[PDB]
Design a protein around this nucleic acid. Structure first.
Ligand SMILES: Nc1nc2c(ncn2[C@H]2C[C@H](O)[C@@H](COP(=O)(O)NP(=O)(O)OP(=O)(O)O)O2)c(=O)[nH]1
Ligand SMILES: [Mn+2]
Ligand SMILES: [Mn+2]
Length: 425
DNA sequence: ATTCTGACGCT
């Protein structure tokens, strides 16, 4: 009872941009705004592969991983923006720079952990404490939460439902107790409204957010009312929320591990995990995963918001599927050089912006007919930012995969160069 | 023949 800690010590938010690459293209090209539109990579094979879809286009069934030619069958009016092509490959620089715009705004409010090109976690515990002291017992008005949903409310038109649930929540709040976790989350949500307003004012981009006591619940909360809304998931909301939540929806369980939880335990929903002992879960899934699962299904997770805004690696990849696979020495060399030229550009800019240098070069390849996504992964020293040296070293390190007797066999279906092991500069 | 990333765990 009094000694079962409840994982209510922190206020954590997850901010995720709405259809991010589409919004970047819509800001640049006003003719795309408020239209069914998507962003593709390449164009020749089936019109290109879609990686981002506006919410208008999602209403017709357009999804990521769809070929644009197929999406047009669902949505004949679909508008398309193509990712930039440089040195014969997709170049995501525009979206990386847009990401930095957003991250720099979020960093004004609190320490953030970049979790992807378009999302960051925010540790708001200290900011909430400061703001609670600033309010000096003053209640929290619904006007301060104009885009917030309270998960699980109302209890007992979409905007009308939203506001009913918010009123129920706010009428229940104990504002005089500076230590109430529910009040702390509410103040967190006020700050996140301010952060999201700043992002939209200063970039034009809309985003959604989750506010809860840890990263997993904040990420889950984010997706519940996208787009352009934020969602507060309280500790008390967890039993009902998890009682029908498929296990695969929880971050890290969308893959083989979640499938094995489902199959070994004979369950479907996160909440059903509560019926197992910590030792039982550790027995099936290992000591780390088992402890994590035991706490997670009760709404509890301890993973910190890491102070890390910048990527830890800078990588350059290209697939060569089907008959396009690289089958000569000259081909492999030329593409390694293209990859290294983009890597050198991004690294030189990184070194000037972020006062750091990469020290290790990772080379990964796939060969045709190989089941694995990495037929080989080998590292070497990254001593200078020179594309010719990096491409020559990558070839030196992969060349003994060639079984030919000028030819390359098995043909390569993927090349990948990644700079890692950064040190201050 | 979604492709192009990037974090993190295991051994
Ligand atoms: N190259 C590449 N980029 C991708 C891929 N998947 C996503 N991206 C890029 C394009 C995406 O815009 C961006 C962020 O991915 P999300 O946050 O998962 N989706 P979004 O923000 O579009 O919509 P929502 O409102 O549902 O969050 O990452 C992929 O497989 N490949
Ligand atoms: Mn997003
Ligand atoms: Mn995202």
């Amino acid at each position: 009872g009094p000694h079962m800690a409840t994982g209510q010590d922190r206020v954590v938010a997850l901010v995720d941009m709405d259809c991010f690459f589409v919004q970047v293209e819509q800001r640049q090209n006003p003719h795309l705004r408020n239209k069914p539109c998507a962003v593709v990579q390449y164009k020749s094979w089936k019109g290109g592969g879609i990686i981002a879809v506006s919410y208008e286009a999602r209403a017709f069934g357009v999804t990521r991983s769809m070929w644009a030619d197929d999406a047009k069958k669902l949505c004949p009016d679909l508008l398309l923006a193509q990712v930039r092509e440089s040195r014969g490959k997709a170049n995501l620089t525009k979206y990386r720079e847009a990401s930095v715009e957003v991250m720099e705004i979020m960093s004004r409010f609190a320490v953030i952990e970049r979790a992807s090109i378009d999302e960051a976690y925010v540790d708001l515990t200290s900011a909430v404490q400061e703001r609670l002291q600033k309010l000096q017992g003053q209640p929290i008005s619904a006007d301060l939460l104009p885009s917030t949903y309270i998960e699980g409310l109302p209890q007992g038109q979409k905007e009308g439902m939203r506001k009913q649930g918010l009123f129920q929540w706010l009428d229940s709040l104990q504002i005089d107790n500076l230590t109430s976790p529910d009040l702390q989350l509410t103040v967190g949500a006020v700050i996140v409204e301010e952060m999201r307003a700043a992002i939209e004012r200063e970039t034009g981009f809309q985003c959604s957010a989750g506010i809860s006591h840890n990263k997993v619940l904040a990420k889950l909360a984010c997706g519940l009312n996208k787009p352009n809304r934020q969602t507060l998931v309280s500790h008390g909301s967890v039993p009902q929320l998890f009682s029908q939540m498929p296990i695969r929806k929880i971050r890290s369980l969308g893959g083989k591990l979640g499938a094995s939880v489902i199959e070994i335990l004979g369950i479907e929903y996160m909440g059903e995990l509560t019926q197992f002992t910590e030792s039982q879960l550790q027995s099936h899934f290992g000591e780390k995963n088992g402890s994590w699962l035991y706490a997670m299904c009760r709404g509890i997770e301890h993973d910190p918001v890491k102070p890390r805004q910048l990527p830890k690696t800078i990588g350059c990849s290209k697939n060569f599927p089907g008959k396009t696979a690289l089958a000569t020495r000259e081909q492999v060399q030329w593409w390694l050089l293209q990859l290294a030229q983009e890597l050198e550009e991004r690294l030189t800019k990184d070194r000037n912006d972020n006062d750091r240098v990469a020290t290790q070069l990772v080379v990964s390849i796939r060969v045709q007919g190989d089941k694995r996504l990495s037929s080989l992964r080998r590292c070497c020293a990254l001593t200078r930012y020179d594309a010719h040296k990096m491409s020559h070293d990558a070839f030196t390190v992969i060349k003994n995969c060639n079984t030919s007797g000028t030819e390359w066999s098995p043909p390569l279906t993927m090349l990948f160069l990644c700079a890692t092991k950064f040190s201050a500069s």
